[PDB]
RNA sequence: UUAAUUCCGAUAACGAACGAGACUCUGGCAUGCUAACUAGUUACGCGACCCCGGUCGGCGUAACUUCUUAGAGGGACAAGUGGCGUUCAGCCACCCGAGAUUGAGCAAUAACAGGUCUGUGAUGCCCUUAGAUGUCCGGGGCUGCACGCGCGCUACACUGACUGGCUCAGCGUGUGCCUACCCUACGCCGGCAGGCGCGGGUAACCCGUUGAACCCCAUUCGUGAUGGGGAUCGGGGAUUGCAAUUAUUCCCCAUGAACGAGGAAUUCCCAGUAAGUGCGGGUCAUAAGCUUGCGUUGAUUAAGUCCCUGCCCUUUGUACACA
């Protein structure tokens, strides 16, 4: 039916964005609404393209790195809808929300740089690609030479960012750069 | 970079003033008449030359041309 | 062909016969004025033009170069007996011809005449026929020991484009002294 | 009643497929088979995009055949989603009133344009002196 | 009625598989125990009935696509061929299996030889494949 | 005598066989279409054989 | 330096555990099981498909590589 | 009766205006003729070195060589063929003319 | 202002060309034209099967160019709207539209004490000139090894290791000129290697309708210098050329090390891009860790600048002078 979509099992409805800054990026809300997120590409034309992209897609295409992981989408698609009910049947609140929650949370703000140290704050959609990355390269760093997989690594990873209790990878490195550009300033 | 060349700006305002009676605001107007009047060898050329035409009449619509 | 042979090597061993057939009398009648020959492919019959400036320097007395030249090509390549066929044609505008004042130049400049009037009655021959641009390079050693490649350009003379191939003809000769070898570059 | 025969090619890439549309009941297939037993089953519900936005009353007197050739298997779902979309559009465009051909096209606009219209991407001959296209080989110093 | 294209064939050669063991006719040697599928492949095969399974699959190429050799059962079976240090290739498979069982299959009676080579499938094949078609069909339903 | 050890070493493979018709040299040979024929003299008299470098 | 000792087959008090704990645990994931269990991942698979044959586990996603079961449903 | 005429040429126009005129001129001679039926071109990619000696940087030529193909299928006798074949011959299109 | 001495403009300058622009080949689409029994499509009828209808790359012949192939042309131009800028050259966002940047070739003047006599019966000088610095045969060497670097290939695993099932490409190539040397189809012998006779093709016919790798699905394993790695080594069995050991090449078994994600330093590139992973051509009696094209899947970041390494002009003292 047209008047709903379910991805996989979930509706685009009870997703709640607390900030204003992030929702403007994310555009994940109202247009692509889909069944599953593969695509084909060309979402890197003008300088503000790349935030149309949905924040599901960009999960997919951010796990394929290091040379072996190149051309793993039908993988990994299915590893993120794996890592989706190993959420859900711990949390038992939306995923969706809690993704967006790990996303408010984890947002570096401030970062020094070397221009002394200029220590100045980041675009919203940096912070954004940055948090993606954080995770992405967390969640590849937890699953090596360990029986964990890739899902639940991704699951526990996101669990943590959304329970904010300096256990998370992004979360613990956005209070350290924050930590560093707070001390040299 | 779309700049357009002095092999156009020589031959546009010739055929202007030349012809300045058959004209029009319309590209496809004035697209086939230079085909009739100039020898244009390709077509990247005269679509070239006929938008330099057009920006010309647009010149001369809003006011006076110094060249 | 009998045997019938693939097409896509009977092309190759065509062009490999036509590059013989033109080396062989680009070197044979250089000293008679030969610019080159033309050749229409006819059953039984092959007929073949050579282009040739000076049609009495090319026959000898009677055509008998030309039944030499026949022998050669039934002998070597392999033909029945009348199955090849020449003609001599009078090469037109040959001031603006670029091998034919180029093999003018050649033996005038071996055996002796000036080095820069020679160049200059050239250009200004070429120049009153019709002629658009010119360009002539003369590399190699200049009565001495270093070289110097000379250059007497005047005119237009594009370089560059895609039609430029068919536009310019381009003439490459090789001197032969007994010091030295010489080249000179006509367009 | 009348054979309405529409042969309509999907092409977007190497993979191309012809839809060719009918009258009668409702059974697509694709050369003789369902969108049932797809591998891999991740993409189930790719080729239902456009089933479940139009509903099991537009498909009720439309089946499609399709025969496919080239390219590899996403490819291949791409190039029958386009076809069999392009050649719906021409059964409704071609027939029957063009007002409930709008209606369904303002659907297909709002989605997707991969539908309806194909993009000119192809893959770029590699250069010579690299191992890829732009990639070039290490210099070698010293 | 369904069609063996309507059938996935992913659980249509196990039920022929488990059909071929409910025969119990088709020529197994004791060298298949012993035996390496091809040069590229590593190790025996880990199952110890997959005479069957090849039987199965050259029953269901022979009934979709009719008229084929030895060049034809290699290019299916293939893989990797790592050497080792050297980059890898594509090799093709082994030519005696696969005749014995063309050779298995000719012996019973479902195929019929075809000029020019070749094993097509007979009429009355037709009607067992789909028969098992049907079971199939009924055992998922 | 030598024409004994002139025909002792069969020429029935490779640069032994075949060689260039111009220069004969043991380098830059072509055995595909028949050429048999050094690069350099290839890229000479390439226009004449009716090759030509348009892209 | 380091090496994790993990069982080849059950055990008496790991069998009682696993009668007792594992119907209580909400996620039922097999590298999560190994850990706790300190068993090797063979015996991990075996026991999930005891517990299959058994019946007191629900099937939410089977897969080769990672199967994700679940406790007895609650409503 | 059933003639098989294939023609073989490097070049475009000329084997188009010849084709053509065959074309026309069998309309003129009043007997039935089939379309120009357009063969696949082939293609001929020559890499090679330009330096003679092995020094500098490593240059790599593109030389590109064409043929193409077209054919007339006729039915006619092979005295009104030969008549038509005999005029209008260039060096350019080769003929293959076969009858089964 | 742009990739550009590409244009407005200032005017002791006006008027031209070279390079670029411009021009050629290829790609994105034109259900409008012509054509296809060595490309097909839709149906008619026959045969097989299931229970009035479906399936068939099983067969014979009626329409057509909707797929393929390719002669001819078109469109795409900053044309339309809104902003910046002398309101000039022009620049940016947006609607509609197959595309609002496909790639390459040709590439001005001037020069190197840059390379090539070891490509040349292109060539000057010197030497050799018979017991020859010429020509021919059997071997050796070109591979060699305390050491330092250059170009490449594969692993250090759980994202993985093993076994089957399932499903796709386009470049190509090929019956002889001396000359033997070509693609292989099919039924068999054998675990592989390899062998026996056999039909098709001078090619949109034959290989072939290229079931290629990754992929997805279903079994075995579980943190162990490990089932990853095959570096190292032994025995046997075959093809190639007259002739292989220092292993030409292929097949089977056994041997199971270094390697726990890498220090200083450094190379390449910015969308079907890197990358994973294959297949043709050349080198080819035997011949891919080389090179070039053809495919499949498919990302992160960026729409700025001279701080760092170069190159190109400028004002000017002129220890920079066939420079
Ligand atoms: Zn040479």
């Known amino acids: 039916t047209p008047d709903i979509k379910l991805f996989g099992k979930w509706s685009t409805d009870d997703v709640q964005i607390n900030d204003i800054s992030l929702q403007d990026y994310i555009a994940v809300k109202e247009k692509y609404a889909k069944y599953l997120p593969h695509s084909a590409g060309r979402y890197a034309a003008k300088r503000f393209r790349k935030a149309q992209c949905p924040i599901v897609e960009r999960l997919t295409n951010s796990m394929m790195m290091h040379g072996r992981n190149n051309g793993k989408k039908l993988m990994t698609v299915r590893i993120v809808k794996h890592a989706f009910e190993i959420i859900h049947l711990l949390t038992g609140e939306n995923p969706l929300q809690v993704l967006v929650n790990a996303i408010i949370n984890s947002g570096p703000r401030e970062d020094s740089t070397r221009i002394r140290r200029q220590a100045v704050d980041v675009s919203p959609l940096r912070r954004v690609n940055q948090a993606i990355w954080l995770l992405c390269t967390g969640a590849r760093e937890a699953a090596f030479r360990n029986i964990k997989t890739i899902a639940e690594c991704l699951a526990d990873e996101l669990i943590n960012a959304a329970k904010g209790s300096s256990n998370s990878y992004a979360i613990k490195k956005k209070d350290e750069l924050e930590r560093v550009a707070k001390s040299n300033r | 970079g779309r700049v357009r060349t002095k092999t156009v700006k020589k031959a546009a305002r010739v055929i202007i003033e030349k012809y300045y009676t058959r004209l029009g605001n319309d590209f496809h107007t004035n697209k086939r008449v230079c085909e009739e009047i100039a020898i244009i060898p390709s077509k990247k050329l005269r679509n070239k030359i006929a938008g330099y035409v057009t920006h010309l009449m647009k010149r001369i619509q809003r006011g006076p041309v110094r060249g | ?187 | 009643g009348p054979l309405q025969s529409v042969q309509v090619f999907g092409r977007k890439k190497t993979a191309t497929a012809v839809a060719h549309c009918k009258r009668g009941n409702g059974l697509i297939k694709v050369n003789g088979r369902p969108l049932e037993m797809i591998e891999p089953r991740t993409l189930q519900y790719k080729l239902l995009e456009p089933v479940l936005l139009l509903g099991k009353e537009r498909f009720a007197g439309v089946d499609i055949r399709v025969r496919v050739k080239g390219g590899g298997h996403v490819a291949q779902i791409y190039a029958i989603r386009q076809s069999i979309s392009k050649a719906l559009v021409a059964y409704y465009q071609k027939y029957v009133d063009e007002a409930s051909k709008k209606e369904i096209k303002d659907i297909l606009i709002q989605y997707d344009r991969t539908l309806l219209v194909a993009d000119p991407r192809r893959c770029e001959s590699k250069k010579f002196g690299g191992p890829g296209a732009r990639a070039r080989y290490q210099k070698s110093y010293r | 009625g369904v069609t063996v294209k309507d059938v996935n064939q992913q659980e249509f050669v196990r039920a022929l598989a488990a059909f071929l063991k409910k025969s119990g006719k088709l020529k197994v040697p004791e060298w298949v125990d012993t035996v390496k599928l091809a040069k590229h492949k590593e190790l025996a095969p880990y199952d110890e009935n997959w005479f069957y399974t090849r039987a199965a699959s050259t029953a269901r190429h022979l009934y979709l696509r009719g008229g084929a050799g030895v060049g034809s059962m290699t290019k299916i079976y293939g893989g990797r061929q790592r050497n080792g240090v050297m980059p890898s290739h594509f090799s093709r498979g082994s030519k005696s299996v696969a005749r014995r069982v063309l050779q298995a299959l000719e012996g019973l009676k479902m195929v019929e030889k075809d000029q020019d080579w070749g094993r097509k499938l007979t009429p009355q094949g037709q009607r067992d494949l789909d028969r098992i078609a049907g079971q199939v069909a009924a055992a998922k339903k | 005598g030598h024409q004994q050890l002139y025909w002792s070493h069969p020429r029935k493979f490779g640069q032994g066989s075949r060689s260039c018709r111009v220069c004969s040299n043991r380098h830059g040979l072509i055995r595909k279409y028949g050429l048999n024929m050094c690069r350099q003299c290839f890229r000479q008299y390439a226009k004449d054989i009716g090759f030509i470098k348009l892209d | 330096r380091d090496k994790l000792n993990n069982l080849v087959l059950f055990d008496k008090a790991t069998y009682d555990k696993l009668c007792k704990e594992v119907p209580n645990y909400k996620l039922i994931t097999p590298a999560v099981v190994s850990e706790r269990l300190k068993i090797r991942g063979s015996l991990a698979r075996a026991a999930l498909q005891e517990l299959l044959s058994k019946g007191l586990i629900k099937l939410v996603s089977k897969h080769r590589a990672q199967v994700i079961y679940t406790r007895n449903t609650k409503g | 009766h059933r003639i098989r005429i294939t023609l073989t040429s490097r070049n475009v126009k000329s084997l188009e205006k010849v084709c053509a005129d065959l074309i026309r001129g069998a309309k003129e001679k009043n007997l039935k003729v089939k379309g120009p039926v357009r063969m696949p071109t082939k293609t001929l990619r020559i890499t090679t070195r330009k330096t003679p000696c092995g020094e500098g940087s490593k240059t790599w030529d593109r030389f590109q060589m064409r043929i193409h193909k077209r054919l007339i299928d006729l039915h006619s006798p092979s005295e009104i063929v030969k008549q038509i074949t005999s005029i209008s011959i260039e060096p350019g299109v080769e003929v293959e003319v076969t009858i089964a």
């Open chain 3, 1 to 187: 062909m009998a045997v019938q042979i693939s097409k896509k090597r009977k092309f190759v061993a065509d062009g490999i016969f036509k590059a013989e057939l033109n080396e062989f009398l680009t070197r044979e009648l250089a000293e008679d004025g030969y610019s080159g020959v033309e050749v229409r492919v006819t059953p039984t019959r092959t007929e073949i033009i050579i282009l040739a400036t000076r049609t009495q320097n090319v026959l000898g007395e009677k055509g008998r170069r030309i039944r030499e030249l026949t022998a050669v090509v039934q002998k070597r390549f392999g033909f029945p007996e009348g199955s090849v066929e020449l003609y001599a044609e009078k090469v037109a505008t040959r001031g603006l011809c670029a091998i034919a004042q180029a093999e003018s130049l050649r033996y005038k400049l071996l055996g002796g005449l000036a080095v820069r009037r020679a160049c200059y009655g050239v250009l200004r021959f070429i120049m009153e026929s019709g002629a658009k641009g010119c360009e002539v390079v003369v590399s190699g050693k200049l009565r001495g020991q270093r070289a110097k490649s000379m250059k007497f350009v005047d005119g237009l003379m594009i370089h560059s484009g895609d039609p430029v191939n068919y536009y310019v003809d381009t003439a490459v000769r090789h001197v032969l002294l007994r010091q030295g070898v010489l080249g000179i570059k006509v367009k």
